[PDB]
Each structure stands twice: as structure tokens, then as C-alpha cells.
Design a protein around this ligand. Sequence first.
Ligand SMILES: OC[C@H]1O[C@H](O)[C@@H](O)[C@@H](O)[C@@H]1O
Ligand SMILES: OC[C@H]1O[C@H](O)[C@@H](O)[C@@H](O)[C@@H]1O
Ligand SMILES: OC[C@H]1O[C@H](O)[C@@H](O)[C@@H](O)[C@@H]1O
Ligand SMILES: OC[C@H]1O[C@H](O)[C@@H](O)[C@@H](O)[C@@H]1O
Lengths: 150, 150, 150, 150
Amino acid sequence: MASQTITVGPWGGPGGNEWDDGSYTGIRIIELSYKEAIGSFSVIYDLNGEPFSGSKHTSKLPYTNVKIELQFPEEFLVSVSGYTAPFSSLATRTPVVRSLKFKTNKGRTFGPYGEEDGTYFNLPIENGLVVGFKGRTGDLLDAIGVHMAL
Amino acid sequence: MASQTITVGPWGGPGGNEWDDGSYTGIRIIELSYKEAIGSFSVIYDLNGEPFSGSKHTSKLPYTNVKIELQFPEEFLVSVSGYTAPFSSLATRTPVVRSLKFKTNKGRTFGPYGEEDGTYFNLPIENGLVVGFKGRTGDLLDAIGVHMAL
Amino acid sequence: MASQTITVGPWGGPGGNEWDDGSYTGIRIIELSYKEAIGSFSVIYDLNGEPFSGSKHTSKLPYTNVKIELQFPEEFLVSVSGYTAPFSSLATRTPVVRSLKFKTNKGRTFGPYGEEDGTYFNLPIENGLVVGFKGRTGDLLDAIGVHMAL
Amino acid sequence: MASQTITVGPWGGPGGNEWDDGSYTGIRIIELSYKEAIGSFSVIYDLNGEPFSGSKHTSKLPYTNVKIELQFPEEFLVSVSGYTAPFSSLATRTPVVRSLKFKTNKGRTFGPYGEEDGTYFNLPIENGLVVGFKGRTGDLLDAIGVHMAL
Ligand SMILES: OC[C@H]1O[C@H](O)[C@@H](O)[C@@H](O)[C@@H]1O
Ligand SMILES: OC[C@H]1O[C@H](O)[C@@H](O)[C@@H](O)[C@@H]1O
Ligand SMILES: OC[C@H]1O[C@H](O)[C@@H](O)[C@@H](O)[C@@H]1O
Ligand SMILES: OC[C@H]1O[C@H](O)[C@@H](O)[C@@H](O)[C@@H]1O
């Protein structure tokens, strides 16, 4: 196939429908919505020094919207963490992403957003960069994973 | 300025002495000891098709020794997981690696070894290989981290 | 700072103005113009399975246009080669790219385009993929280099 | 399969017997022998901060031996270049490695060794590191290629 990157995760459940943004050169902006779990999730990547908009992974729920704006390129993620559990408001009870938190190399923290409820996942990055996301979304964020590169 | 890989981790605490095995072409044998926590941890890497013995990180503790023999190259790790916590019996209450578990692409599970107490960590690898480990060792395994390559 | 790739070259001289398309998932189309030397050079990359248009590095000179359409992703480049040297009136001081030739994994050759004069350059790729180009262009393609991944 | 690197080449002919040292962390020492072509060729690699000897690819011919010692890790190769052509004093008139030259980031040039006859090859490295060699040896060095990593 084409060029490719190291992929970790997914954390979360087998619900909703798969999506993969693919890889890019870094991250500029993450946009998510949240209440008791994570709803929407959408990313403005850097591609070779300019913004590139990933597909929107919108949840239909009326959740609070946040926009995490990184000082790209000198600021970048060193950690992604959160929790996974079901959220009872569904017909199926499969685990979903209840919370996300992000930390950066400058010591900014974004989140937690959502409810720190369930099982903990934590991706600390000692060397390397986050360069794309993938997940599964239905009414909300069922699962999340990350692509990495040097 | 020597060649680098993606490194994730570490998971555990600031105790003991740093070690870094660096990177190789894959994993052949993992060797560890356990009881209440992980003591010893050593690895036989693959280096360009032949075994390469990593440095030993051995604990003096009279622990149970286990040898994890992967059917290299067809079988490789797809998950590293475990638990970190203080171990009350150290002259310090700093967190160490209480448990480890390993899963492979053939569906085998090795562990849990040690005791599942404290904060869970989990690295599921969807695409990528483990090519090295780094860590910290005092009397026990204080921290572990993993290098990944395509 | 941002994601990086293996970069080889440049081949050619220090004239014209520098450009770098950066890196992508692979190559779909190369468009160039030629006569005595290479003029125009532009690329349609694959970005995560969709085409992405590289910046245009156009020559005004009335040269022959060629479009090289690979059957991506099954078909890819396995060799970039060419010749560099000064050219007559337009590039008297410094070498420019006089010719380019490309080989693919399916045994297609595209070119030589231009004239085979001066100093030979040859990049046979045994493993890895071309994921981007860089260069310098004035009236002509003064230089070219390649980013590679995998 | 297991971990891989980008590999460019080969330069030279199809004669002799193939060898492939694989990949490591970097380069400490190149040893070669030369007269009107390249004879012997062997490398002491860096592996995670200690030397690792590659297999000797020695020529029995009465040539001049040369040890290229880099100031590892701060000094590394940025260029491998040379010439290939058949060599009169041989039975098969396939091309062999006639000359090699090596440049470093420190500004040091080692070579040219042998004789600059036949077809030029030239790998300038703008980003990335040489982390192994592969080749072919009979009574002389028939071909050479390079593995590269970030
Ligand atoms: O997004 C959570 C939930 O949303 C909908 O109910 C469906 O798409 C489920 O599969 C999914 O698990
Ligand atoms: O390894 C567990 C423990 O061993 C010793 O007590 C010391 O090296 C500590 O720093 C360390 O935490
Ligand atoms: O591109 C060929 C030639 O075109 C112009 O003359 C300038 O932009 C030069 O610097 C360059 O070398
Ligand atoms: O290496 C030079 C030359 O030496 C030997 O004669 C053989 O292995 C040839 O195939 C090879 O071309």
C-alpha cells in the first residue's frame, strides 16, 4: 500500500462506525465536544506547514464545544490519556470514550473533558510525534487511536 | 544524534537506576522474575536475523523466574500492559512495576505476572513493532518503556 | 518541531529559488516540461488515499509538457535518475537539471526527458517509497531532491 | 517479517556473492582496501552506544588498507559516492566498485579511494543517517548499497 505510520490503540469499544484521518505532519487544532462522554472529535492537522482539515466526526448530541489550539510547531502533544466505559444512555452497553486529556511539551494541559469514569488509558510520548487520529463514532466517540511518527 | 525510534512510556516511578537497551530488529525472548512486583527484566532481541542478548536488569529478590519465548519472526507482541504502584516493603514509597502482561499476534497471553495493583497501563499496537525496552531498576523494576518501529 | 523524513540530494545547483513540497503518502502524477533541460516540475501526491496537488514550479519557457501517471498505489517509483550541468544562456554559472528519468516497479520507464549531458545522478530504491520532492526553480529546474519513507 | 529500513542501491554490478550487514544505530569505523578498484570492505557499527562488528568482506588481493574512524556520535556520514566500471584485470567484464569517497557533517572527506573510472554515483544525505551497508563481494567489491534511518 502507500506510506504508513506506527499506530497505537484503539482505546474504547467496537461501537459506532470506523474512521481514519490518516497521517500528516503534526497537529494544529483539536475540536471536541463533551458532557458525560466525548461526543464530537475533529482535527486541523499541519501538512507541510499549512493547515489541513480532517473530516468532521460530529456527534448529534447538544454537548459543550471546545477548541484546543496548539502553538504549532514548537508546541506539540506529549501525552493523550482518558477513560473508557459504557454510557447507559444507549441500547447497547459497549465502552466509549468518556474522557480525554492532552498534555504538551510546554506544560499546557487540556482537559479533562468529559467524565473521568471507567478504565484509564495513557499514552505518554517520550520521543515521537502524534500525526493523525483514527476512531469509531456513532452518537459519540466510541474509540480513539493515534498515528505516530518521528 | 545516533539513530532514534518512537518511544512511549515510561510507566512506573523515579526509583532505581536508568537503563535503556536501545533498539533492534524485534523480540525473541523476554526473561523476568516476579512475586509482589516485577523484579528482573531482560530481553533476547533479534538483530538482523540472529539473537542479540540485552543487558541484564536483574533483581536480587528471590522471585519466580519466567522465560517468554516468542516464535520469532511470525509471532510478535501486540500489547504490553501492566500495573504500577508503590510497594509498601521498600524503604521508599515510590511507584514500581507491580505487574506485566504480554499479548501476541497469535493470540497468546503471557502473564499477568506479579500482582495487579494500582494504576493500569496498556499499549495496544495496531501497526508497528516493539524493537526495544528501556526502564529503571533498583531492587525491583521501577519503570518500563518501549521503543517502536515499523 | 514537525514530522521529518529521510531526504536525499539535492542534485543540481544553487540557482533559482528554493521550494519544498514536503511529504505525503505517495505519488500519483508527475508533470514536467523539457527540451534541452527540465523546465516545469509539479506533482499530484496521494495524501491518505486522496489526491493532493503539490505547488506548481512552473517554467514560462515554451517546452514540451509530459504527464507521468502512475497506477498508485500498486505502481510506484523504484528509480529517479538524471543529469545535471550548466545550460548555455539561461544557466551559465551553475548546473541545472538537464534530464530526468523515472522507473517503476511494474517495469515502466518514463523518460529520459531533456538532454543527457553533464554529471549523472542515480537513486535506485531497494526499499522505501518516494513521498515528496524538493528543489529549486528559476527559469528552469535548477535542483531536485527527494523525501523518502517506509 | 520484522523491522526494516529504507535501502538505496545497489551501485555496481551483478558479480560476486551478495551480503547484507543489516541495520544498526550508526557507523563508527569503515575499513576497506583499494588499488585500481575497491577490494575489502567491512564496518564497525554503533549498536545502542557500543561497537558491533559487521562480517568481514575481505579481498585477498595485495591492496592498500584504510581505516576510516568517525568521531562517533557527533560525526556521521552525509555523502557516499564513487565510481563503477568493469576492471581489465578480471575474467568477467561486469562492473565493480572502482572508487569510494565519504563526506561527513564535520567537513571531513575520506577518499577518493581506488580509481575514478566509469559511471559516477552520488548519494547526498540531507536528513537521515546511514545505519548499514549491503553489497556484493567476489575477489573485489562488485556492488554497494546503503540502509538509512532517522
Ligand atoms: O456512539 C455510541 C453508540 O452510538 C449509537 O447508539 C450506535 O452507533 C452505537 O453502536 C454506538 O456504540
Ligand atoms: O527498585 C525498587 C527500589 O530499590 C531500591 O530501594 C532503590 O534503588 C529505590 O530507588 C528503588 O525504588
Ligand atoms: O533556473 C535557471 C536560472 O534561471 C534564472 O536565471 C535565475 O532564476 C537563475 O538563478 C537560474 O539558475
Ligand atoms: O569481485 C570481482 C569478481 O571476482 C570473482 O572472480 C567472481 O566472484 C566474480 O563474479 C566477481 O565479479
